[PDB]
Design an enzyme around this catalytic site. Structure first.
Site, PDB file in Angstrom:
ATOM      1  N   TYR A 230      -2.706   6.227  75.578  1.00 58.24           N
ATOM      2  CA  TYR A 230      -3.430   5.540  76.858  1.00 58.24           C
ATOM      3  C   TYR A 230      -2.293   4.363  76.896  1.00 58.24           C
ATOM      4  O   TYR A 230      -2.231   4.111  78.366  1.00 58.24           O
ATOM      5  CB  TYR A 230      -4.541   5.240  76.327  1.00 58.24           C
ATOM      6  CG  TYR A 230      -5.836   6.182  76.590  1.00 58.24           C
ATOM      7  CD1 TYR A 230      -6.148   6.436  77.915  1.00 58.24           C
ATOM      8  CD2 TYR A 230      -6.320   6.652  75.646  1.00 58.24           C
ATOM      9  CE1 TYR A 230      -7.254   7.705  78.102  1.00 58.24           C
ATOM     10  CE2 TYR A 230      -7.262   7.628  75.575  1.00 58.24           C
ATOM     11  CZ  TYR A 230      -7.663   8.077  76.815  1.00 58.24           C
ATOM     12  OH  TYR A 230      -8.720   8.819  77.035  1.00 58.24           O
ATOM     13  N   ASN A 399     -13.198  16.050  73.920  1.00 55.20           N
ATOM     14  CA  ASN A 399     -12.757  17.093  74.895  1.00 55.20           C
ATOM     15  C   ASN A 399     -12.018  18.284  74.070  1.00 55.20           C
ATOM     16  O   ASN A 399     -10.972  18.775  74.772  1.00 55.20           O
ATOM     17  CB  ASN A 399     -11.747  16.541  76.063  1.00 55.20           C
ATOM     18  CG  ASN A 399     -12.393  15.328  76.628  1.00 55.20           C
ATOM     19  OD1 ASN A 399     -13.756  15.261  76.796  1.00 55.20           O
ATOM     20  ND2 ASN A 399     -11.650  14.429  77.207  1.00 55.20           N
TER      21      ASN A 399
HETATM   22  C1  LIG Z   1      -3.388  15.151  82.710  1.00 51.68           C
HETATM   23  C2  LIG Z   1      -4.389  14.854  81.682  1.00 51.68           C
HETATM   24  C3  LIG Z   1      -3.854  15.775  80.351  1.00 51.68           C
HETATM   25  O1  LIG Z   1      -4.652  16.757  80.230  1.00 51.68           O
HETATM   26  O2  LIG Z   1      -2.878  15.449  79.648  1.00 51.68           O
HETATM   27  O3  LIG Z   1      -5.767  15.395  81.991  1.00 51.68           O
HETATM   28  C4  LIG Z   1      -6.564  14.699  80.996  1.00 51.68           C
HETATM   29  C5  LIG Z   1      -6.329  13.079  80.897  1.00 51.68           C
HETATM   30  O4  LIG Z   1      -7.352  12.456  79.923  1.00 51.68           O
HETATM   31  C6  LIG Z   1      -6.940  11.202  79.710  1.00 51.68           C
HETATM   32  O5  LIG Z   1      -8.138  10.821  78.925  1.00 51.68           O
HETATM   33  C7  LIG Z   1      -5.847  11.003  79.097  1.00 51.68           C
HETATM   34  O6  LIG Z   1      -5.586  11.550  77.829  1.00 51.68           O
HETATM   35  C8  LIG Z   1      -4.681  11.550  80.155  1.00 51.68           C
HETATM   36  O7  LIG Z   1      -3.349  11.295  79.518  1.00 51.68           O
HETATM   37  C9  LIG Z   1      -4.934  13.293  80.347  1.00 51.68           C
HETATM   38  O8  LIG Z   1      -4.037  13.476  81.492  1.00 51.68           O
END
Ligand SMILES: C[C@]1(C(=O)O)OC[C@H]2O[C@@H](O)[C@@H](O)[C@@H](O)[C@@H]2O1
Length: 752
Positions: A230, A399
């Site tokens: 982050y 996630n």
């Molecule tokens: C494009 C993307 C990904 O999948 O990498 O979408 C999800 C986003 O989640 C946030 O929490 C970050 O991790 C953020 O970096 C993430 O970016």
């Protein structure tokens, strides 16, 4: 034309590289061809039928935020190909219209005000998609009708009308509100985006919770070390917005913006090694195939290049020097290969300027007390140490990402050398997650994601040159306790373990190392001067081992030696391991393709239900087999103590003595006596001086730590916080650690 038009064009250039984008540049032409290449692939696979139920079959699902976000990302890439000078798709009318028709369809059937703002995954709906849509709107601004722009921008305003979150989330809201404000020309929303950076988790230093800390740490989601995850996002977003606004009516004026320069010097510089951003501060992002350490490192340098465009003196110059160094350093993956075209243009201007010299490489020991991390940077190698405690979680897994990150922050050691690819090239989906280097665990048993019950996690820094760290181990998932320490000197890292006890009924082991080998898995290695078999699929126990040498994946600069004081029995195995990123990142975008990598894994078997077991080994970076054998004949380190009460190591040549005191009882280790829990390091220069640094790693002592040093001094000088009460016949002083938050206090005594 107005100022908003100026800002829009300024942002457009940040996206396309601008009109001066020289196509006669090797890396540029290479990037522009890759861009046009990806664009044609997407455009060719698009369903352009007027009765389509999706844009791309593979990404169908108007309600699946993951896919919708990806759809907009593809359209962004396509828009980039149609507006980037040099692209074979530059100005293509048909491509542009197909993109806009796609946005219209997505508006009517997927992304609009009829959907909930908080539906999973909220990040996509409120931040991801708007960031892509805003960019497309800027790139194709001149081709977008009022009717179309309204549907695009009104929708973004519905999902994210204001800035009210914290940290990365807040920064993302700021860039979404800001870029849209430029597009629709709303001075109120734009001023809001500007002010947004002054909020929690961004400009102001955090003293708890999310954000950048004065000591260089970065935390996100309350309890996770996240500088490279982050943190990278906060840096990129902040750098882009600040640059966009710089020089305009809405230029950032907040004095705390100066903290940003410190992020680079203190939060990032010590955690980068030849282009790689250390995985120990990337959180769950270590499970992302598209975000391995060098890919992440490039993004950080891209941000530094961005800051170098508007930062005030002497920061702009310094940033240019840093970027130049890292670009030259990374021979694993070309920096220009995965960064924006504008970044390439700006970077080349720096690299090609003979008046700019690469900055010196970092050389120091730094304790990131606020996020339970520590790092040692030296010529030829860097060592990162990842810990956890009552304040920092073991690992993050949300996630469906990083489900096997169990021990990645439980006394895990990460060694960086000339094998720049060590942690990349599919290391994470193939390495044995149950055997992270440096950790002590119940064999093949996991632990939960969360903070521990032990507060003693941290260390001491001696003038930012050398140091020692420690972690009082206590897992909640099963019974297992131990005292783990690390002593960082010049080219020796001593790891000590004591009081290893368990009633879990599971074999307990400490991982000495687990290294990814070359493609043939035949790296030469030796033990006690005798060559060991190099075949794959072979497990073998080494008994009475004094030293081991493992040849690296590079001809020079990647060998690693291991010394075992008193001798040790080492369990080892060399094997080819297969896995998939899908196994550690269960998301639709994740590839399920199998990958195979080779490993040399070595650990110590403490047995089942051990009682007071211990270990001790020395990591010796960049020594040849011959040199490791020579070291064993006269080891430069001496173990002073390795009990449950105190762990101490002396490095005679450097005159250094480190000692971690685990209890609040008076104990002595060599010349050092402490009455409470503490991390201490002294350096004695015969008949000259005796340096001393002390810290309270628990960050809970509301009084002092009383130290006594067995030497007679003539005089002294010390940090405020230290009170010296005696110089002779022995040195005595107390260190006020109330609210110290794990910082180290230093004193210098004149000897005589
Ligand atoms: C494009 C993307 C990904 O999948 O990498 O979408 C999800 C986003 O989640 C946030 O929490 C970050 O991790 C953020 O970096 C993430 O970016």
């Amino acid at each position: 034309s107005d100022e908003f038009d100026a800002l829009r064009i300024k942002w457009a250039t940040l996206l396309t590289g601008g009109p001066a984008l020289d196509p006669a540049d090797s890396d540029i032409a290479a990037r522009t061809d890759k861009l046009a290449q990806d664009a044609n692939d997407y455009w060719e696979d698009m369903d352009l039928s007027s009765s389509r139920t999706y844009i791309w079959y593979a990404l169908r699902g108007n309600g699946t935020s993951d896919n919708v976000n990806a759809v907009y990302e593809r359209l962004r890439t396509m828009a980039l190909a149609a507006t980037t000078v040099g692209s074979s798709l530059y100005g293509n009318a048909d491509l542009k219209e197909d993109i806009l028709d796609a946005l219209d369809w997505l508006y009517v059937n997927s992304y609009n005000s009829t959907r909930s703002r908080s539906a999973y995954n909220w990040w996509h709906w409120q931040l991801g998609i708007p960031m892509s849509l805003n960019d497309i709107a800027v790139l194709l601004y001149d081709d977008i009708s009022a009717a179309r722009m309204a549907t695009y921008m009104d929708t973004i305003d519905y999902f994210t009308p204001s800035i009210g979150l914290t940290g990365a989330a807040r920064a993302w809201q700021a860039i979404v509100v800001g870029v849209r404000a430029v597009i629709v020309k709303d001075a109120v929303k734009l001023a809001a985006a500007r002010n947004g950076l002054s909020g929690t988790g961004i400009f102001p230093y955090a003293t708890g919770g999310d954000g950048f800390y004065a000591d260089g740490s970065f935390v996100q989601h309350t309890t996770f070390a996240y500088t490279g995850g982050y943190g990278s996002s906060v840096l990129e977003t902040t750098a882009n917005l600040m640059y966009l606004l710089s020089g305009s009516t809405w230029s950032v004026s907040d004095p705390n913006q100066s903290n940003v320069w410190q992020w680079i010097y203190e939060a990032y510089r010590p955690l980068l090694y030849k282009g790689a951003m250390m995985d120990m501060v990337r959180g769950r992002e270590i499970s992302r195939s598209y975000a391995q350490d060098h890919a992440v490192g490039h993004g950080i340098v891209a941000s530094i290049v961005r800051l170098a465009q508007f930062a005030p003196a002497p920061h702009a110059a310094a940033f240019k020097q840093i970027a130049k160094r890292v670009i030259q350093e990374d021979t694993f993956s070309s920096f220009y290969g995965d960064v924006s075209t504008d970044t390439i243009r700006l970077a080349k201007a720096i690299v090609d300027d003979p008046s700019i010299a690469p900055a010196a490489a970092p050389n120091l020991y730094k304790q990131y007390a606020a996020m339970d991390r520590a790092v040692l940077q030296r010529p030829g190698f860097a060592l990162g140490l990842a810990l956890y405690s009552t304040r920092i979680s073991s690992y993050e897994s949300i996630n469906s990402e990083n489900g096997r990150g169990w021990y990645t922050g439980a006394g895990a050691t990460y060694l960086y050398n000339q094998d720049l690819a060590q942690y990349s090239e599919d290391y994470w989906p193939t390495v044995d997650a149950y055997r992270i280097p440096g950790t002590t665990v119940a064999s093949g048993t996991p632990i939960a994601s969360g903070t521990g019950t032990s507060s003693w996690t941290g260390g001491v820094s001696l003038a930012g040159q050398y140091g020692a760290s420690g972690m009082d181990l206590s897992y909640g998932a099963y019974n297992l306790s131990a005292r783990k320490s690390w002593f960082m000197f010049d080219d020796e890292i001593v790891a000590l373990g004591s009081g290893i006890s368990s009633t879990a009924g599971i074999p307990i082991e400490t991982v000495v190392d687990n290294r990814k080998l070359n493609g043939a898995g035949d790296n030469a290695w030796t033990a006690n001067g005798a060559a060991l078999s190099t075949g794959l699929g072979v497990a073998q126990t080494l008994t009475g081992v004094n030293w081991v040498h493992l040849a690296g994946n590079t001809a020079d600069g990647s060998d690693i030696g291991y010394y075992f004081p008193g001798g040790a029995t080492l369990q080892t195995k060399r094997e080819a391991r297969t896995g998939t990123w899908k196994q550690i990142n269960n998301r639709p975008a994740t590839p399920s393709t199998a990958v195979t990598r080779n490993y040399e894994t070595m650990w110590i078997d403490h047995g089942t239900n051990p009682s007071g077991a211990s270990y001790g080994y020395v990591l010796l970076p960049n020594k040849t087999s011959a040199q490791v054998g020579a070291y064993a004949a006269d080891p430069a380190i001496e173990i002073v103590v390795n009990t449950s009460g105190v762990q101490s190591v002396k490095e005679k040549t450097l005159g250094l003595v480190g000692a971690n005191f685990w209890t609040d009882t008076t104990q002595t280790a060599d010349l050092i006596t402490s009455n409470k829990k503490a991390s201490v390091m002294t350096r004695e220069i015969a008949d000259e001086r005796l340096e001393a640094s002390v810290s309270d790693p628990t960050q809970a002592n509301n009084g002092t730590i009383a130290i006594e040093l067995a030497r007679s001094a003539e005089g002294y000088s010390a940090d405020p916080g230290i009170t010296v009460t005696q110089l002779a016949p022995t040195i005595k002083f107390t260190v006020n650690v109330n609210g110290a938050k794990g910082k180290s206090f230093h004193a210098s005594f004149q000897l005589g």
